[PDB]
Amino acid sequence: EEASSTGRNFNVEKINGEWHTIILASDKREKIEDNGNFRLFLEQIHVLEKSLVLKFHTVRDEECSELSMVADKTEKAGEYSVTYDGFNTFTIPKTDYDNFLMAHLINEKDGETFQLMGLFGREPDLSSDIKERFAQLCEEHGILRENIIDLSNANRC
Ligand SMILES: COc1nccnc1CC(C)C
Ligand SMILES: [Cl-]
Incomplete structure (x- = not known):
């Protein structure tokens, strides 16, 4: 079964646990290129009552830096907000x-x-x-494949 966080049947508890960044994509490519602040490697998602605790690490000169973020539910169901290099x-x-x-x-x-x-x-x-399927979802958002970066061979410290 599949679901969308904005969907009626979404079960947030089921995204709890281990996750890894496989592909990142952006209409401002620099943001996910080497040393971009959004070149983020997910490690874990902890589901709480009204928030998600996201554990990531970034990489600079082959050196891993851990970072944790708290994303809060907004007023729209399935949407979360978090402060990180902006809003x-x-x-x-x-x-x-x-x-x-x-x-x-x-x-x-x-x-x-x-x-x-x-x-x-x-x-x-x-x-x-x-x-x-992910490249097709990116296309539905106006993000070209040339702005999609597979990081599956760069996600372990
Ligand atoms: C694009 O998705 C993201 N990118 C950066 C930070 N958090 C998210 C939300 C995910 C981890 C649920
Ligand atoms: Cl499509």
Whole structure:
């Protein structure tokens, strides 16, 4: 079964646990390139009553830096907000809970904005078919494939 965080049948408890960043995509590519602040490697999602605790790490000169963020539910069901390199809101347009999770995030900083999309997997990689479904979701948001970066061979410290 699959669901969207904005959907009626969404079960947030089921996204709790281990996750890995498989692919990141953005209409401002610099944000996810080397040293971009959004080149984030997810490790875990802890589901709480009204928030999600996100554990990530970034990498600089082959050195891993841990970071934790708390995302709070907003007034729209399935949407969360979090302060990080600006103000962010995000939703999960599609997840099957057991294998993949696709997220769409809007960042706003210094009066600007950009879209960030992410494909996260329970294991350190996902099938080529799920990677293709993710490229199609990115296309529905106006994000070109050339702005989609597979990080499955760069997600372990
Ligand atoms: C694009 O998705 C994201 N990107 C950066 C930070 N958080 C998210 C939300 C996910 C982890 C649910
Ligand atoms: Cl489509």
